[PDB]
């Protein structure tokens, strides 16, 4: 019915109108200061006044850092674009990592645009070519409430003739993009043949020419690559164009500047609205020195959106550097531009409440003794261990037909599955590198 994967028990930060974080709200316990700081960042994002802010949150494993990074995006709503990312993804064979990072930057900021389209549809009455060159064609589109004739571009003529339409076939043509698609033969010819593959459709409702307003959203990078390379099109010319250069290529800054200029021109008329987003990078310690060096200049850009980073490491050497040691594996010349949000480990009561909530979302019932044993195990080995072991206890309860988790089931789960500590203990005393 429902699927849960280490998340979906979180619906938001659950803060008050004064910014005060409740002790238990929105699938969250503790970390009041971190949640308050994240809410402040959310308000700053909604302000849209200043761009280029960079913050990171540092904490131990299983401290809810990624949980916070998902909660902020949940609070921002689906309207604001959010771009999850991992540090390893920047290494692409096709193009250099700098281009990938800039592409993600452009993807982060969105844009809402409204436009009107003209639509023609109806039953075809005649195909009259106007014939060195491909001549135009006069089409006799006929609807139930009207009839008119149109002249078509020779590319549209090629496209419609590729559809293998004839007289009496209902077709659909878009006036803006030139898209042509035949729904099927008109219902009038349904009884023409006792056995024909072609399906029949009713006559279109309304007049042939229709107009409508659509406020569809397109990201900046989407139209950037639209200008960079050709896209789909029913003509053979479009296929040739998009097959000539299939491999992606890095985009020069000239195209980006022209895109910015045309976007500003669009927003001047009020047709478009700008909505900056948030870029999230996880395991930032996995990046190289050159990536951080380029990010130093990237953050100083005027259009670069707000980026959030996450890392769990102490005094470590930055990748690509033989001797440079800095906290969280982030070079010192970059941490100055950053704002660090501390995260702290939980307590026994917090772990127990987390397990209770995880059981509730999992639609399971746990007895008091079993819950206490799970809390003790979590405090004894790791928080994640109890969450992982939850499902096997449910399976064991299903096997024994009982509807609740008992001490026997969790004990059997402990016997069957080993944590990291027990596995390491076995590894230390093993025959041949077990």
């Amino acid at each position: 019915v429902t699927r849960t994967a280490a998340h979906t028990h979180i619906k938001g930060l659950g803060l008050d109108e004064s910014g005060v974080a409740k002790r238990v709200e929105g699938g969250f316990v503790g970390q009041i200061e971190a949640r308050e700081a994240c809410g402040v960042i959310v308000d700053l994002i909604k302000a849209k006044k200043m761009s280029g802010r960079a913050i990171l949150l540092a904490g131990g494993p299983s401290t809810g850092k990624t949980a916070l990074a998902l909660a902020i995006s949940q609070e921002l709503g689906p309207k604001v674009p959010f771009c999850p990312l991992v540090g390893s993804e920047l290494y692409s064979v096709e193009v250099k990592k700098t281009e990938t990072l800039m592409e993600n930057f452009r993807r982060a900021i969105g844009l809402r645009i409204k436009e009107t389209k003209e639509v023609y549809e109806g039953e075809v009455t005649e195909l009259t070519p106007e014939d060195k060159t491909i001549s135009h064609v006069i089409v006799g589109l006929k609807s139930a409430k009207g009839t008119k004739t149109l002249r078509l571009d020779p590319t549209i003529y090629e496209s419609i003739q590729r559809e293998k339409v004839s007289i009496g076939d209902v077709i659909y043509i878009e006036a803006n993009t030139g898209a042509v698609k035949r729904v099927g033969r008109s219902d009038a010819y349904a009884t023409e043949f006792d056995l024909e593959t072609e399906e029949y459709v009713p006559l279109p409702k309304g007049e042939v020419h229709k107009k409508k307003e659509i406020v569809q959203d397109v990201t900046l990078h989407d139209l950037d690559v639209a200008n960079a390379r050709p896209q789909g099109g029913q003509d053979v010319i479009s296929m040739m164009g998009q097959l000539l250069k299939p491999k992606k290529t890095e985009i020069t800054e000239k195209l980006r500047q022209e895109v910015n200029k045309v976007v500003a021109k669009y927003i001047d008329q009020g047709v478009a609205e700008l909505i900056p987003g948030v870029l999230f990078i996880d395991e930032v310690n996995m990046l190289d020195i050159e990536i951080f060096t380029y990010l130093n200049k990237a953050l100083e850009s005027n259009i670069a959106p707000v980026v959030v980073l996450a890392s769990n490491r102490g005094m470590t050497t930055v990748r690509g550097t033989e001797d440079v040691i800095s906290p969280h594996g982030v070079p010192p010349d970059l941490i100055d531009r950053l704002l660090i949000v501390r995260t702290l480990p939980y307590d026994k009561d917090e772990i127990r409440t987390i397990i209770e909530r995880r059981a509730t979302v999992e639609r399971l019932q746990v007895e008091s003794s079993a819950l206490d044993l799970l809390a003790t195990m979590g405090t004894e080995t790791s928080l994640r261990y109890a969450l992982q072991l939850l499902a096997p206890c449910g399976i064991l309860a299903q096997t024994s037909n009982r509807k609740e988790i008992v001490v026997n089931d969790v004990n059997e789960a402990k016997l069957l599955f080993l944590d990291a500590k027990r596995s390491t203990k076995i590894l230390e005393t093993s025959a041949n590198y077990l």
Partner: protein, 97 residues
């Protein structure tokens, strides 16, 4: 054809028309000769490709037909009960406003 028709959905939401002709180097004004470009477009006109189905499917998002029973909440739970009545040999009456 069936799998392609059923499983092709996404469209290139951002497009720029007349860029295809410029990319291929053929348009009203270019460094190529008029007769050569005319022959090129003639050949493209008379060359057949088996990818036209995918081209049309990706270029425009056809509404298809099965979505009629999928966009209505009542229609979602009506077909199941109609089938159930069919297996039990029961006729049904429907009243509308």
């Amino acid at each position: 054809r069936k799998i392609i028709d059923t499983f092709a959905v996404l469209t290139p939401s951002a497009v720029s028309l007349d860029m295809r002709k410029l990319a291929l180097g053929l348009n009203d004004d270019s460094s190529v000769g008029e007769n050569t470009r005319l022959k090129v477009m003639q050949n493209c006109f008379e060359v057949s490709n088996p990818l036209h189905q995918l081209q049309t499917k990706l270029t425009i998002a056809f509404p298809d037909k099965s979505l009629l029973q999928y966009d209505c909440g009542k229609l979602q739970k009506l077909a199941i009960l109609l089938q159930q009545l069919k297996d039990n040999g029961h006729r049904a009456l429907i009243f509308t406003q």
